[PDB]
Symmetry: D2
Subunit: 236 residues, 4 copies
């Protein structure tokens, strides 16, 4: 039990976030969980850390506090993220700074710090949560900042997979379709379902299972795994 692997999960307060915290706990990992807003936990194997993930300082804190508490860092799930649907010509300098802060710098900084720790242990797993919009964008869903920002995460997943190829660190991505959260109003479900060839929305368990499959799949790196009800496969 001081033998358990430690995962760092970002955006841990959100809907997929909690689901991931719970599932990693269920698979005998200790968790360092991080959010803008996260509150401390009863569970002595869940260490929470609150901070703005886009700030280099926050990343420094996550890992430092994680090493001090548990003795190591083995995995990282990059789940901090914002989405914005807006016509490209209408986006403002504020829309830009906000997406580049959360989706890009909030990947880059912990990923760098967590990777240092793994490289030195000769072992690890980085998984980032991306979006099927990267590979398959849609007419009627304008989100140029999502493609820019998440598409860079797909490509850097493959790049780091190569860079860390002989080091024992594996680097993967899960690209979901539209996932039912509380923050998605009940009225919007008929049309959101219709965004997927299968005609259902995703469920949190769908994505969480993909992450845990990749966590335990020791021959998989550089892989982008689509959990999107068919979205990436073709046009519906």
């Amino acid at each position: 039990r001081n033998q358990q692997k430690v995962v760092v999960i970002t955006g841990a307060s959100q809907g997929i976030g909690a689901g991931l915290v719970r599932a990693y706990r269920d698979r005998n990992y200790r968790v360092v969980a991080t959010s803008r807003s996260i509150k401390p936990s009863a569970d002595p194997d869940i260490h929470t850390v609150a901070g703005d993930i886009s700030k280099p300082e926050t990343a420094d804190r996550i890992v430092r506090e994680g090493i001090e508490r548990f003795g190591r860092i083995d995995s990282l799930v990059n789940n901090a993220g914002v989405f914005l649907a807006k016509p490209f010509v209408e986006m403002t300098q504020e829309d830009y700074d906000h997406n580049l802060g959360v989706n890009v710098a909030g990947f880059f900084h912990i990923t760098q710090r967590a990777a240092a720790e793994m490289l030195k242990q000769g072992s690890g797993h980085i998984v980032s949560i991306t979006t099927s919009l990267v590979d398959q964008p849609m007419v009627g869903m304008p989100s140029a900042l999502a493609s820019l920002t998440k598409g860079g995460l797909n490509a850097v997943t493959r790049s780091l997979a190569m860079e860390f190829s002989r080091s024992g660190v594996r680097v993967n991505a899960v690209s979901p379709g539209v996932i039912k959260t509380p923050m998605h109003p009940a009225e919007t479900h008929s049309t959101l379902a219709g965004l997927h060839p299968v005609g259902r929305m995703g469920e949190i368990r769908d994505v969480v299972d993909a992450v845990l499959y990749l966590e335990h799949a020791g021959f998989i790196t550089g892989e982008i795994l689509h959990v999107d009800g068919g979205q990436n496969a073709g046009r519906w």
Copy 2:
């Protein structure tokens, strides 16, 4: 009730089931309590009553018929199909013969095509199914020094039809996926070749039967995935090493 649940278990057809990857899928499917129709050119019958064995040339329409017929006769339903039968040839393209062409077309394409047509007819009929094919990462990432035009042709075909049929069967409850392995450690790969075959992956080691098997079973239970190609390949598909 538990007896009721046994006599009504999911049913998978597994092709190329005799050894290596296929024989591993049989056991893994049994471990999750599927019943199994295992086929191979020469599979011997099993002592497990929940494995039905059917010996035959998978490239013939008549074998596909039989597999499903005897499948239905013995278990009443067909839920899933793993196209695992496959041949692989390494040969410069300009030296490939008519015989090589027929052999690969037959097993890799006709093999896939007939059983898939018949299994899908049943899955459509009952409104739910899973079809998964085993392909190669040479489809998406071929390599200088590994000349295998026929594998690309035939397996590249399976990759494309996997997405095609995922769209066609979108509204029917039938999911369609592939697993695209790297070079997997099998008895048919003698020890002398292992260190060479290992450097065929960015990660510098060979794949295991367990890796490919777990990918198929993960797709099997992943009710929100269709038309997906899951590369299990030590990073081959990701980039150049």
Copy 3:
């Protein structure tokens, strides 16, 4: 014999004839084939009639071309068929016909041509696939176009790698729905709508794509989509 020589398959109708003309205009001699092709007045176009599924047709084509023109420099695989049909309905005859034209058609000539191109240390082989390979559609059931042309996209990357160090380049052009005579103006309205740009392609679009690949010496193993955006996302 200074003029480069191209073999163009499915030369008779549609893209293929557009292709003969384009390559003639760039000073190539042409060996042109299809089931029904008729002899040409042009001394620089030699026609060969035959069923491209048969190894004998390929054998004729290459040897007749080496006879008249003394070499082979390029091959454009443009013979092809297409069948819209529910997968569970496809028949043995549907299977043999598609495999024969789409796959065997490609294999025999590509093999004989590639051998000539390898000995010389130079060549270009380009194949016409379809955007349904990467981007198939709900309501366009074509399992056989996918098996068939998908194998061509993949073999394109494969032979690109294999001929890598030899100076032979292998590419593919993957069109959307292209406006031939074969499509009644009844259909045009419906077919335009299978592209994000809401426009059918012209023959010019595909032909210029082939001619571009043919003069782009640093491109190999590429799939160039000429598809009004079909491959790029969901409309």
Copy 4:
């Protein structure tokens, strides 16, 4: 009456090849770079600036609208490239790469696009890199993959967005191109980074851009001009 093209990173060798090729086609050209001397040619308007700044995009577009009355085409060719282990990358490496590679595409594209949308017609092409789709062991470049990889995907995303508006959006993904930046003692090594075993020439990329410029039925396409890099492992 002549079409108008904006070309970023116009002082680089690719940049200068593009300027000439578009002039050979009778376009008027707005050419920007950090340092670019004014032009003799009434038909080439140069704007000096740092493209990482939004202010610079504003100026480029309004100056082209001022001089020539329209913008038909945008070529994003500004770029930097850093080879460095991911774990050694500094705040300054980061801000630099994000500035030139992402911001340097984004603002200029947003302004040129507003103009093209108004006329109902246009072309946006961006020069990315083969490392996005085919990264290489021993070429560590996380920031290049992060920045140019966003470019590829926005390329397909804007092709869908502008789909019914008459604006085409495409990309050219080159291999290693023979440039003054690469000394001759290095060529034999860079050649080996393509399955084909040679480096590219300026004209290979330039023709690719001009081909896409004249190809009215292509949008959302990444065209790989890379000696086979994207196609497989060599």
